[PDB]
Design a protein around this ligand. Structure first.
Ligand SMILES: [K+]
Ligand SMILES: [K+]
Ligand SMILES: [K+]
Ligand SMILES: [K+]
Ligand SMILES: [K+]
Lengths: 93, 93, 93, 93
């Protein structure tokens, strides 16, 4: 429970950093920066948005390496410690 | 066995939600909406389709976080509890 | 060892199916079809190639769900049962 | 600790190979080649860069299969043996 809260906060902070960075350096609207940060760290990578500056490319390399781990950690705990219990409870005959 | 059936249903429901959402808000043909939902949740992300509206971008963020876990859960069980047994049986000398 | 050989063969067969399908239905050159199949099943998804026909989109949905599991199974075993031993042996003082 | 250092070095070497290959065969600037190599091995795959030559497509297939395992191995150890301890220490009441 507290573990999920910590990953939640960590993920939020990571996404906030990405939103601030891409909106500033890559000139994206804040919503697009947040959306791009999520699409990046979850490894979907549509490419509708991508860094055009070298500063952006370098940050993206570091952002991915440092963010993928926590984002997927949060996703795992969300599905196993939150979603799983709910589906099971919806079964209880 | 029953576990696989539950993940199967859950995945179907998740994909149906995506199909309805993207066909309505993003104006995609139903087949393209389903295809896009799958390409998104499996993290392939070709980008041949991507949300153009803010409503679509926000939903996509939430859809990914909530759907990746179950989709990959189903994929895992499919390969370990269904595909694996079959390949092994095809070996039995 | 034999496990790695089985996953190797399974991966080859899966990629051959994709190569045949995309070169025929989507009209790609065989090399591009193989390349696209790999980029798809490893979830990279550049999007330089993507299915344009409904037949192709439907097959892609099924191909991903059935192929991701085995492809990543092979990748895991390759890194743990082949690459890992080699790096360790290159260390042995 | 030493495990993390080995994966660190291995990842560096893998990325250096990609940087050299794509800058030479695909004609990318070194920074773009490094960026593309990272985007590829972490499976993000934006597609802003992608191999245009057959030599590049073939290398990419092999690069992905051999590199994804080590890159994600490093990411895992980075998050579990480096990031995790730090966040926990930042909690210690
Ligand atoms: K991807
Ligand atoms: K991916
Ligand atoms: K992608
Ligand atoms: K494009
Ligand atoms: K893409």
């Amino acid at each position: 429970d507290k573990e999920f809260q910590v990953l939640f906060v960590l993920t939020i902070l990571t996404l906030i950093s990405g939103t601030i960075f891409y909106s500033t350096v890559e000139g994206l609207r804040p919503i697009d920066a947040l959306y791009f940060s999520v699409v990046t760290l979850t490894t979907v990578g549509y490419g509708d948005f991508s860094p055009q500056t070298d500063f952006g490319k370098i940050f993206t390399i570091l952002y991915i390496f440092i963010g993928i781990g926590l984002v997927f950690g949060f996703i795992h705990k969300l599905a196993v410690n939150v979603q799983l219990p709910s589906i099971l409870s919806n079964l209880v005959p």
